Amino acid sequence: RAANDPFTIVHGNTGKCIKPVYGWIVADDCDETEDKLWKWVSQHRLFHLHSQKCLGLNELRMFSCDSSAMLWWKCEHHSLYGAARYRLALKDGHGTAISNDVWKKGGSEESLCDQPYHEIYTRDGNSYGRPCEFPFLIDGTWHHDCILDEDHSGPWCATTLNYEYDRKWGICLKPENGCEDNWEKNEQFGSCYQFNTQTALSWKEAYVSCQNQGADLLSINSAAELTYLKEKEGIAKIFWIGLNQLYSARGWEWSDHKPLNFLNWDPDRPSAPTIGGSSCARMDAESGLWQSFSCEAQLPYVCRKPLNNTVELTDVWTYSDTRCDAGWLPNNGFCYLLVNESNSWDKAHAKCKAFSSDLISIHSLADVEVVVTKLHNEDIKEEVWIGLKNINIPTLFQWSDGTEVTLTYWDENEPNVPYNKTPNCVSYLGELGQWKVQSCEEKLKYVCKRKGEKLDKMCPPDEGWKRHGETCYKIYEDEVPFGTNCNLTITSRFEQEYLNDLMKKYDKSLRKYFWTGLRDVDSCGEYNWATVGGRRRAVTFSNWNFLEPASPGGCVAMSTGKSVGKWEVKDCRSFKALSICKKMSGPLGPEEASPKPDDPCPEGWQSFPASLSCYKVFHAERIVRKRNWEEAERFCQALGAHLSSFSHVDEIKEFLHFLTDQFSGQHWLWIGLNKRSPDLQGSWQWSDRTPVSTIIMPNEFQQDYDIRDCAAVKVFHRHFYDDREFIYLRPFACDTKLEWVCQIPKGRTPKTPDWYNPDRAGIHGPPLIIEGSEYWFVADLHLNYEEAVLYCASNHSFLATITSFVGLKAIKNKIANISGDGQKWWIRISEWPIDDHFTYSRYPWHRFPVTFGEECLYMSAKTWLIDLGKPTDCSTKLPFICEKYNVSSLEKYSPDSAAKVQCSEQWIPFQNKCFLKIKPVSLTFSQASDTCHSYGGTLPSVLSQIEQDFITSLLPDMEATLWIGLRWTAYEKINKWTDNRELTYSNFHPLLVSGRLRIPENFFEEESRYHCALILNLQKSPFTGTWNFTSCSERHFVSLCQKYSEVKSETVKYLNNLYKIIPKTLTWHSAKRECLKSNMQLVSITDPYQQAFLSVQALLHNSSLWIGLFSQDDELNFGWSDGKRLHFSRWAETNGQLEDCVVLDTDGFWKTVDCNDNQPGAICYYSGNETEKEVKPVDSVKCPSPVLNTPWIPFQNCCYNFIITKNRHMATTQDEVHTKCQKLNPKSHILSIRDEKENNFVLEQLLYFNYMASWVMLGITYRNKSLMWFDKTPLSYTHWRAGRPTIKNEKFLAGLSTDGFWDIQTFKVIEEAVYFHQHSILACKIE
Ligand SMILES: *[C@@H]1O[C@H](CO)[C@@H](O[C@@H]2O[C@H](CO)[C@@H](O[C@@H]3O[C@H](CO)[C@@H](O)[C@H](O)[C@@H]3O)[C@H](O)[C@H]2NC(C)=O)[C@H](O)[C@H]1NC(C)=O
Ligand SMILES: *[C@@H]1O[C@H](CO)[C@@H](O)[C@H](O)[C@H]1NC(C)=O
């Protein structure tokens, strides 16, 4: 389990207590804690359970923590420091900061920081399982734990910071003693289940949620459990199963420690080996099939707790020096032997079965230890059979002779059960002796095992001396100092497990440590084994505790209570621990030097002579795009390398000093360290199977330390390591050994012949596609989506983006002529050319925690009109085509420099251009053209973001619509920008203008209408400045013309606001102090007008300036220094908030930097003319009881139920869905949106399930020859994609999409639109 326990603060120098009262700190008088209790809460704050106030600051006092008054503390060595190098101290009883003491727990010896913050998750509600956020304010009272009232279901908490303004709650998930409440005390069989649906949680988050309750994730071991999970009523259609491979070199493991014998892998997944693959599994409940999906997603899960669990063990680590039949290797009473002759599986089984033996069987780590240590150096170059076969359907591995499987040791990463294969065989490979699949038809060696009979003064066990087979172990009575007579050195994990069993058998209670000969004599941070004289055995194995490395000096010991064998670090000066040793050692173990410091790098890899390894760094501009930790590791493995993993503590600083020369700005990089695997139990590990031995990470008391399990390194332009999640995108740097060769799997470098042969072949034969650049048709080479994108993307070439219907028809004809009407091709279909730099996938109303998936599309030669907006399983090998970039920044025109340069008083100048305003009179586009031509210039053409910001800042005084002035023929691309300028970017919000491709009527002789664009002034809406396209035969207002001018390329008042640009180079705290010195505060941008004005003002200064945006919750939730809700945001990236404080870049985007830095300016604001902050939502609607684990979320006098559950009845869905919503709960019909805010609410609820559902079913019919809802009511409000539909029949499916638009799929056969039914949600409102 895991929970936060209330504690007390104790001083170290003066060994007494703490006492907060209304005014200040007073005399302790504690040891009667009925009047004081402290607990850590969010934002690194301390909360008192008695006064219900949070401590803060320079007089220290208890303030209500609904304020921004530097209410946060940090984790020092053994003390606490505040905002900027502050400190916490007391003087004569009263506490006051000192800025230069230690504080420990009550009844313990640690700095209030060693135990990580264990947050709790929620089960169901309007939050979808998001973790709690304590404290929360209700009825004027601050609650720090889950409450229990007669209104809600059970223990429920608030999941966000401000509960009053969000009204998002969730039923808590607390550890229970039995499986009676919120569980199912019986299952199939011998466990209790908890099916929590509607919870968009990642794999690691779901595992942490199931583990905090003492249980674990799912575990399927027999077909009975599978068929019980299939026929369960309240279960999600797709969820997690805990099956994962998050280790370095392990095949596939269960979440809980259970053997993997029953496999149900989907036969459609091609099992992408390195790029495009995954490491966590996923279960589909409709067919009950297993897939390998990228477990960075957000899918529901299910917890499983063993019913009446018992701690049963055995004598798995014993000793028996028995003899065998003169040649059979004896080990622990058994005899193993492998035949050197080539044989099959069944034939060899029958061969060595005729003796008094049969094929080998591995039940625990003893057999694995035998297989690895013996067998001629773990069978360096060999393949050996093993008596595990499968003939059942589904797959269920079983031993040749046995009763039950108990340990599975797979090879990373291929259990690899074929589709059409009745016999399934396993074999040995790898330096760790792991298992892979075979065909029971290859000729390779085999091993088998015999039960032998039971049977020197060099090792007398008379004095309590245990034996292991080659080297005995001996424990001593007591030893206070370190290494009194002996120090122990461990070499591998099997020796560690033997030592753990010996320690558990020796002692009977907890809190007795055993010494270990690992220390740092030089106090250099790197740990090495103690030298007993002429011994320099390097560290080959390491297993620390959760966060053990904390001091660059000390001595290690081994705990035995629950952290069995975890190498803890204690003071090597004075600390008592027991001692264990061995007699023999390894003479040939540390005698090996494989790398050589004289071998150079193969090609292009840079390295310094003090590295013995070649490096290859991937900058943030050369690559196709940044990627997550797992994607970076897979990209490094594809090239034959891994992430940078240093052995010594000087190599890290040398590598940092070597990379900081290749960088100008500061940006994080990926590293091999990660604690993602559940078997590590919190300890770190290197991805290349190298034991961690140095202090690399500090101890930051983060709120989600269990979730962020990846290590990121920071470079400076002058060794700071942080813990990032496995979802953030980040550049990386692979590294290879000085003697090993790299790989080239059709990626970056092996494009060298792919830049000459196919490029010229496509430039010669294939002509230019109609209305577009050249398209190279990469066929006869099937690659995944990630591999196709990596192949197409180059210095100029990239993945083919289709934005026109003419180009669509051309590529369709070329595909039909080249490959056929059956093959599929990877195409990125859109309406306007999208920029890979700015994804524009930012929600405008709120920043809710949902990571959207990848939109990897496809298209075929036939059925292209239907499958153009349907995503596929893009871990598939298919041909593709690559497009070519043209000369963008190479065209030069406008030779007139001093003649046309004329900026009069009716002209506002900006960067290399100038604008002029006219009256807001209304004219069409063809008239507005000559209206601007009446003056000298052109219509306003936008080529960058800051020009759009300048236009937006000029917009408030203009009309509600402006003619931007770019025209294009309908159903084609956009060019010429009315001024012979290449279209760089376009600002079309996908929530207002449908980003999908437009499909016209296929019968049009010459009716080629034109489409023009305009800028909207949406009157306080967050979409002002965006562009909208329309048939410009109509007329709109015109208030702007642009021209080019060459020779001439304080307290500011703006929209009832006073802005001051401080040019001082200072931090964010000093900036806030300087703003407060002028009776002002840091600017809080709450509207796009202020954002655009501040952006153009920052461009006028050519440097990024500070703003009033900062974070306290470990960069999870941002907020303004004024106490204003973050509603408007213009971040530069989706997941780019990598540091704490915020600055406003010159390009108009909010950059994020750690505000312990120097920025060349800041922005202070003052609001005196307009001071309005009165906003409070009212929620007085209570929904009925939840049904089938699907609650009713209230919204505006209604109760919606997005039924994400097993449903396959798709026969006459019109009445079927209605009866389904009816018998589920009366007084509730199908969903029918009749407003605009309701559509946004439905879209928000859909976006939480964007990984398993892309549409929400709507109740649209065609009764009485008109589109109307199921109820007797007309259809007032509608949100279509492109015009009103033309549905004449009544057989069609209406679905609210993931962009707010309503799509309609018509069909003639009911069994043809099942793809729309598989990805739909059945919502039944109440009203
Ligand atoms: C962005 O531009 C598009 C134009 O392509 C705008 O779509 C147009 O919006 C108007 C306003 O609602 C529609 O007029 C309505 O037509 C229905 C047809 O049944 C009629 O019943 C209403 O009384 C009203 O006249 C118009 O049909 C629609 N489409 C076109 C081609 O003009 C869109 O509104 C613009 N976006 C924003 C935010 O204004
Ligand atoms: C809900 O009902 C109350 C009282 O009938 C009404 O004041 C309120 O406007 C309703 N909500 C909406 C969104 O109309």
Residue numbers in the entry: 30 to 86, 93 to 135, 138 to 492, 498 to 760, 767 to 1097, 1106 to 1383
What did the study's authors say about this model?
Given that DEC-205 adopts a compact conformation at low pH, we prepared samples for single-particle cryo-EM data collection at pH 6.0 consistent with early late endosomes where DEC-205 traffics. The structure of the DEC-205 ECD was determined to a resolution of 3.2 Å. The DEC-205 ECD domains pack tightly together presenting in a lemniscate (∞) with dimensions of roughly 110 × 70 × 70 Å. Each of the tightly packed DEC-205 ECDs could be built from the N-terminal CysR (R30) to CTLD8 (E1383); however, the C-terminal CTLD 9 and 10 were invisible in the reconstruction. The centrally located and globular CysR and FNII domains lead into a compact 60 Å ring with a central cavity of ∼15 Å comprised of a counter-clockwise arrangement of CTLD1 through to CTLD4. The second and slightly larger ∼65 Å ring comprises of a clockwise arrangement of CTLD5 through to CTLD8. Here, the central cavity of the second ring was occupied by an extended loop of CTLD5. Each of the CTLDs adopted a compact β2-3 loop architecture with the exclusion of CTLD5 that stood in stark contrast with a fully extended β2-3 loop that played a role in coordinating the secondary CTLD ring and thus in stabilizing the DEC-205 ECD. Most striking was the extended β2-3 loop of CTLD5, which acted as a “recruitment hub”, whereby it co-ordinated several domains within the secondary ring including CTLDs 6, 7, and 8. Here, R895 seemed to tether the loop apex via sidechain interaction with a neutral pocket composed of L1172, N1173, and Q1193 within CTLD7 with peripheral interaction between W893 and H1183, which further stabilized the extended long-loop conformation.
